[PDB]
Design a binder for this molecule. Sequence first.
Ligand SMILES: CC(=O)N1c2ccccc2C[C@@H]1C(=O)N1CCC[C@H](C(N)=O)C1
Ligand SMILES: [Zn+2]
Length: 140
Amino acid sequence: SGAIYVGNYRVVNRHLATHNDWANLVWEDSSRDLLVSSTTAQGCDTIARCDCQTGVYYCSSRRKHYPVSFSKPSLIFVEASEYYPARYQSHLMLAVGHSEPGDCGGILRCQHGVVGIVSTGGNGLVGFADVRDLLWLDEE
Ligand SMILES: CC(=O)N1c2ccccc2C[C@@H]1C(=O)N1CCC[C@H](C(N)=O)C1
Ligand SMILES: [Zn+2]
């Protein structure tokens, strides 16, 4: 579990969004596993606007932050789960690292701010949903 809090927006994994997130929906994309809802209180996270390929992510199943190298956001096949059928997820970045069910939502950060959140895992790989292209998160 986990979310990004920037301005009056809350960014969560779409498959973990609550019924209340849907009532307060701003934008969602099933193909990216992302959902953004509106908030009343202003948040303090800064979104990275860069092409960094190295950063640090939080792994809740280890209670540890790990430094990683990660691939550029791309269209990657994700096996069927209880949340989605087998499909290509877009804007996904992979790193060699640990992730297990329950780790989604952990933040991936570089020197510029938040890059994305954990969205996939298994087989010694961890996948992050990129948020750096969502320029509108920085306004209104
Ligand atoms: C590490 C982790 O999150 N997982 C994992 C790991 C090891 C074995 C199985 C899993 C399931 C789960 C995972 O990858 N997803 C289930 C939730 C939705 C995700 C998506 N973006 O489509 C896919
Ligand atoms: Zn960066």
